[PDB]
Amino acid sequence: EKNVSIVVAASVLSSGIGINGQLPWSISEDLKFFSKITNNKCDSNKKNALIMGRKTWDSIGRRPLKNRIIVVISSSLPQDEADPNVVVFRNLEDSIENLMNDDSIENIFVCGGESIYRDALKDNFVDRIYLTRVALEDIEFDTYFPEIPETFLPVYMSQTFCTKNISYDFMIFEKQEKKTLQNCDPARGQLKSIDDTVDLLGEIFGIRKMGNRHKFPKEEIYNTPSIRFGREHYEFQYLDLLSRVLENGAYRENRTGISTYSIFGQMMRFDMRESFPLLTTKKVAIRSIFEELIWFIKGDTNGNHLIEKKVYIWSGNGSKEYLERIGLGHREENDLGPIYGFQWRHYNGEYKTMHDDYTGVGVDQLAKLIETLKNNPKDRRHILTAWNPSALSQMALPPCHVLSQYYVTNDNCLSCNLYQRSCDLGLGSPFNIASYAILTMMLAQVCGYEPGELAIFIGDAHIYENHLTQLKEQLSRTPRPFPQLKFKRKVENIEDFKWEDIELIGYYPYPTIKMDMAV
Amino acid sequence: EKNVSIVVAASVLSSGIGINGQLPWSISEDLKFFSKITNNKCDSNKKNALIMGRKTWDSIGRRPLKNRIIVVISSSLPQDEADPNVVVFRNLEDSIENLMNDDSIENIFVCGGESIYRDALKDNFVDRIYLTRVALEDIEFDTYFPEIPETFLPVYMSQTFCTKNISYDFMIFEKQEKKTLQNCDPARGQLKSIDDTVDLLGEIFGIRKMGNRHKFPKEEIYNTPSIRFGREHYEFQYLDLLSRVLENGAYRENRTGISTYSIFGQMMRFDMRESFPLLTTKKVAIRSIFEELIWFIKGDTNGNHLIEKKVYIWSGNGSKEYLERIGLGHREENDLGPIYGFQWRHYNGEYKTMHDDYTGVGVDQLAKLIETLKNNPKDRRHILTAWNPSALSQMALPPCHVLSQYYVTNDNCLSCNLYQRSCDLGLGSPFNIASYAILTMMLAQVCGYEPGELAIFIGDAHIYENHLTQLKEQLSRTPRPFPQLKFKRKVENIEDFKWEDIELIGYYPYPTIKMDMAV
Numbered sequence A, B: 001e002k003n004v005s006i007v008v009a010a011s012v013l014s015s016g017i018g019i020n021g022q023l024p025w026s027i028s029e030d031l032k033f034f035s036k037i038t039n040n041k042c043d044s045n046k047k048n049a050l051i052m053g054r055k056t057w058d059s060i061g062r063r064p065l066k067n068r069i070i071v072v073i074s075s076s077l078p079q080d081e082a083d084p085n086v087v088v089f090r091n092l093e094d095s096i097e098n099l100m101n102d103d104s105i106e107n108i109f110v111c112g113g114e115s116i117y118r119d120a121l122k123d124n125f126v127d128r129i130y131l132t133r134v135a136l137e138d139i140e141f142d143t144y145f146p147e148i149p150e151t152f153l154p155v156y157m158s159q160t161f162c163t164k165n166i167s168y169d170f171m172i173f174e175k176q177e178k179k180t181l182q183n184c185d186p187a188r189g190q191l192k193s194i195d196d197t198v199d200l201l202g203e204i205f206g207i208r209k210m211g212n213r214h215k216f217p218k219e220e221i222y223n224t225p226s227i228r229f230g231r232e233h234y235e236f237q238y239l240d241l242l243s244r245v246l247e248n249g250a251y252r253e254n255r256t257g258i259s260t261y262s263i264f265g266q267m268m269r270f271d272m273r274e275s276f277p278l279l280t281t282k283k284v285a286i287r288s289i290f291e292e293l294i295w296f297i298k299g300d301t302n303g304n305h306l307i308e309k310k311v312y313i314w315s316g317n318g319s320k321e322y323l324e325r326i327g328l329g330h331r332e333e334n335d336l337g338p339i340y341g342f343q344w345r346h347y348n349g350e351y352k353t354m355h356d357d358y359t360g361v362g363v364d365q366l367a368k369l370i371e372t373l374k375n376n377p378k379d380r381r382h383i384l385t386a387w388n389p390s391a392l393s394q395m396a397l398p399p400c401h402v403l404s405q406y407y408v409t410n411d412n413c414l415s416c417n418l419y420q421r422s423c424d425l426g427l428g429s430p431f432n433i434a435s436y437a438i439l440t441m442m443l444a445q446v447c448g449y450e451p452g453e454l455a456i457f458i459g460d461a462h463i464y465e466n467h468l469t470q471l472k473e474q475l476s477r478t479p480r481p482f483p484q485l486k487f488k489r490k491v492e493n494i495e496d497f498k499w500e501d502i503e504l505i506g507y508y509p510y511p512t513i514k515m516d517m518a519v
């Protein structure tokens, strides 16, 4: 045999790869990738062959690629016996015989030309596809990468990387077809002895064997199942937690009338250095998120201000009937109480109403946090809490994102840890992830650092039963690279941030998915 | 070919397997295991053969095992043509030819007899060893399982299970010898395309690719490296976190004079249904742990009481010079301040000295916790906190185990979640794990539930540089099954627990490892 892989970089939405004989963007890392991958070979005494259309050959500047051999497909171009590292062929099929000999040629790469790509696929000449997904879709394109035939399936999807604020992925598709079902769990299949034993041990003991209490998700509820050992994109941190409760979540009632399926004690990780964790498998209402955040930062608890800026997430838990219902009927229409923010800027403060001027009262954690963060970074007490046993009863809703800790890496990056007691994976989480990601970025700009990593530890991770068809729909969408989020100016004080100060570069999510909140 | 596996159950320390022709214990699950494993076959038309010494044959009661074929090795016993499911052989070697034919015989199992075991190993007839480790070592034994030859290596170690309070494991050794180094990471080796790509991608980007910031532990610092895909025992949750910081921990200074190597945002899981998470790779001072816990429960803050019961963990952070040093020189010799416990039983209480009678002051979280736990189990607010922004300055030490949440499973089990801001993996963690495990058990007995699961989320997980050789020593020890911890009586009130009320059944740890605390 002999392998044939495609290497291409196309826009995330329309698979745009070229414009007037040029790449529609310039990302050196991707060129470096192309170089690394197409040079990568086992036999020092062999070379790899890169097949390309004549037009691409013109794009390269008709000059050979080091250590490799360029194979140009063209009807006109002369079979120049001159350069040995370059050879011409009249049709794609003929060139492919690199297999049929030139044992000097270890591997084959179809390097480009919408035409050459399309033909390679049509004649089923390719085994693999190395696809760099570039996140910029509103620019001119005149060349495209054909749709990947169904005989191909994704086996790996890298995390998102940034270059000049352009987001991008790296994922490889393999043309697998053989073999039946297969187990989605990547731990199995390593050696039958283990698999068999654990299975047997699982029959003897039942729910007694903890493993049986944490069953790996079934294919039908596992996002992009084919990527079994390469679920690198951090959106799988969420998608999997989703299918993980969908698999083990215990059906249970709660204070609202809508029951949920839940599991206890979970975690998700998110990089923030190369991208912003704004879920792509569903359009997320980032503005509302933001406006809720500064609201907290300000120490505001007047739910009208959010409504005024057309942000209604706190309407439900803020209505007259809800307050009445929870023994706060004395409270004004939207005075949510000593909730987040009040506890952030006025911890332990004696709350009256959302109208009083609490300036000076309580403990300003946010202030101290920022101060400690920049004056004693290696400090191990960079903590922010909203769980006040004394204030709970006055809150419209007990703090869900209970406590967060901050860490300053040796290389001056700011990471964040958040412990959430209760998490609505359907509505909450998406917001929650973005929110604390932003807060970290703000804290970072203000303290002179850059975003590091975001880790969230969940207590009661649940899915409201009325979100089942919706989240199933969402789990059917393959993740796209995360976008980038940047501040347009350096604020002096953390509370000066405004919506206009934010830039969401390259966000191309799937259509929004409607889901109803449980009051 | 044809496989030959040993199936045996021996005591954890001396490999005791028999006493006066009887098993020195009775665990039905293990017999059920033996049955499952020795019956487990691919070809419906074949049977498995179980080889055993005559004495064991007498132990079985000289009656065949269903669906299988018993092969008795004996010099005297008649070659009875009678029972077809039982056949006799004069020597071990001869019997092994089950391979050499009887294609009706799919697999071979060496089922016992210290003598038969010893010979099977000595003549290198066995491929695998299924070893059930039983945790009871102070009983008479007259038969033993020989030491496993070095050609054998452990590839799997189950979680710990209980039966009549006896703890036990299930681990399988495979006689692997071939192949060089091999990567410890179980994610690699699944398919070169992925591995290669990630490696290359890792060269292009550096610390930029998050993965490179979370490098998998190197073999030399990985506990029992051979178990690559079977690290089921939950003590690996700790051992690995250990080697994980040892691999990526950033060297950094802190308030004490001893620097540490740390990583941010980690987690560990522990089952509590079938065993008690008391590390075995090092003898752990469980009594001190306990005495510190009720101390907290009581709401006590007088560090003398611990010293009085010969518990000195809080001496350091309690001395006159330490208090002076942290601006609490006005405080009495061991009045630690509104620390854990005071915040547990008197949250937000106005602290004076360890002598005042705080009865009635503050918020009794522990009390409410217990009440909420039993009156509204599915409740999602079962929280306990020690992080009081207002009290911090009066504490000898800021709360390390910051906040914990509790969950009551549908099957009435009580699980626990703990967020720890700072964790000394060398000294703290071991204590920390046991401590919160016990607290959960107590809360459970008192609320009418049984222990579920314990999950710990770490913020600054670090290793003090002066614990390096010690933890290296510890990482060289292969885990033994966790013990069992039971209460000898049902207390009426949670604070009535006494050391005498506890039973640590089957704890056989490795020798204690001395490590010094950083003040």
Ligand SMILES: NC(=O)C1=CN([C@@H]2O[C@H](COP(=O)(O)OP(=O)(O)OC[C@H]3O[C@@H](n4cnc5c(N)ncnc54)[C@H](OP(=O)(O)O)[C@@H]3O)[C@@H](O)[C@H]2O)C=CC1
Pocket (backbone or CB within 6 Å): A007, A008, A009, A010, A016, A017, A018, A019, A020, A021, A022, A023, A052, A053, A054, A055, A056, A057, A059, A073, A074, A075, A076, A077, A090, A091, A092, A111, A112, A113, A114, A115, A116, A117, A119, A143
């Ligand atoms: N984003 C990415 O990863 C990549 C992007 N690109 C972009 O794509 C564009 C170039 O591709 P595209 O316009 O399709 O041109 P291609 O590079 O495929 O080249 C087309 C030429 O190849 C020869 N050819 C193609 N098919 C045949 C055939 N069946 N028989 C004989 N000769 C054949 C012809 O040359 P002749 O006329 O001389 O006979 C044809 O004009 C550029 O904009 C380039 O930047 C290119 C590679 C990768």
Ligand SMILES: NC(=O)C1=CN([C@@H]2O[C@H](COP(=O)(O)OP(=O)(O)OC[C@H]3O[C@@H](n4cnc5c(N)ncnc54)[C@H](OP(=O)(O)O)[C@@H]3O)[C@@H](O)[C@H]2O)C=CC1
Pocket (backbone or CB within 6 Å): B007, B008, B009, B010, B016, B017, B018, B019, B020, B021, B022, B023, B052, B053, B054, B055, B056, B057, B059, B073, B074, B075, B076, B077, B090, B091, B092, B111, B112, B113, B114, B115, B116, B117, B119, B143
């Ligand atoms: N914990 C566990 O997993 C297990 C525990 N056990 C325990 O071990 C004890 C039994 O084992 P142990 O005392 O060694 O006895 P074994 O079961 O090995 O049986 C010994 C007998 O096997 C025959 N035999 C052994 N070697 C040879 C040989 N080289 N050539 C010919 N015949 C041979 C002899 O019988 P003959 O005299 O008739 O010639 C010998 O007396 C019991 O207490 C039993 O409960 C047993 C299996 C498993």
Ligand SMILES: C#CCN(Cc1ccc2[nH]c(N)nc(=O)c2c1)c1ccc(C(=O)N[C@H](CCC(=O)O)C(=O)O)cc1
Pocket (backbone or CB within 6 Å): A256, A285, A288, A313, A314, A317, A397, A424, A426, A427, A428, A429, A431, A432, A513, A514, A515, A516, A517, A518, A519
């Ligand atoms: C987390 C958090 C903060 N919060 C506050 C908040 C208050 C009470 C709660 N109650 C329950 N049961 N679950 C929650 O997630 C929840 C969240 C949120 C509340 C609603 C939505 C929501 O419906 N979001 C959009 C719809 C509105 C929009 O488009 O802006 C969505 O459907 O995704 C998001 C966040």
Ligand SMILES: C#CCN(Cc1ccc2[nH]c(N)nc(=O)c2c1)c1ccc(C(=O)N[C@H](CCC(=O)O)C(=O)O)cc1
Pocket (backbone or CB within 6 Å): B256, B285, B288, B312, B313, B314, B317, B397, B424, B427, B428, B429, B431, B432, B513, B514, B515, B516, B517, B518, B519
């Ligand atoms: C966690 C926690 C509570 N604590 C309180 C406490 C207070 C200050 C701290 N300071 C630092 N830097 N690290 C700590 O782990 C730490 C822990 C502990 C303190 C010491 C030991 C300790 O030395 N344990 C034994 C020795 C004593 C014994 O045998 O009883 C050991 O060496 O394992 C354990 C727990």
Ligand SMILES: Nc1nc(=O)c2nc(CNc3ccc(C(=O)N[C@@H](CCC(=O)O)C(=O)O)cc3)cnc2[nH]1
Pocket (backbone or CB within 6 Å): A007, A008, A009, A023, A028, A030, A031, A032, A033, A034, A035, A056, A059, A060, A065, A066, A111, A112, A130, A131, A132
């Ligand atoms: N993922 C991907 N990215 C690409 O840029 C790419 N480019 C083409 C075609 N042509 C281009 C043109 C020039 C170079 C080039 O100069 N490559 C050199 C230098 C790379 C570097 O180190 O920057 C090489 O060594 O391959 C690469 C691709 C086809 N498939 C691709 N596929």
Ligand SMILES: Nc1nc(=O)c2nc(CNc3ccc(C(=O)N[C@@H](CCC(=O)O)C(=O)O)cc3)cnc2[nH]1
Pocket (backbone or CB within 6 Å): B007, B008, B009, B023, B028, B030, B031, B032, B033, B034, B035, B056, B059, B060, B065, B066, B111, B112, B131, B132
């Ligand atoms: N791990 C292990 N446990 C054992 O008990 C064991 N026992 C022997 C030898 N003999 C004994 C004697 C009787 C039975 C027995 O009756 N087995 C039946 C019933 C098992 C059940 O369902 O309880 C079988 O089906 O194998 C098992 C082992 C050898 N290796 C072992 N190895």
Ligand SMILES: O=c1ccn([C@H]2C[C@H](O)[C@@H](COP(=O)(O)O)O2)c(=O)[nH]1
Pocket (backbone or CB within 6 Å): A254, A255, A398, A400, A401, A422, A423, A424, A425, A427, A428, A429, A432, B380, B381
């Ligand atoms: O940042 C947030 C704000 C609150 N909620 C949701 C989680 C729960 O669905 C609900 C609180 O439920 P109870 O704890 O009151 O039962 O609020 C979130 O998920 N994240």
Ligand SMILES: O=c1ccn([C@H]2C[C@H](O)[C@@H](COP(=O)(O)O)O2)c(=O)[nH]1
Pocket (backbone or CB within 6 Å): A379, A380, A381, B254, B255, B398, B400, B401, B422, B423, B424, B425, B427, B428, B429, B432
């Ligand atoms: O239950 C406990 C008691 C405290 N410590 C340790 C962790 C840190 O090593 C030290 C506090 O360090 P700083 O946060 O003060 O830097 O106390 C624990 O690990 N666990």
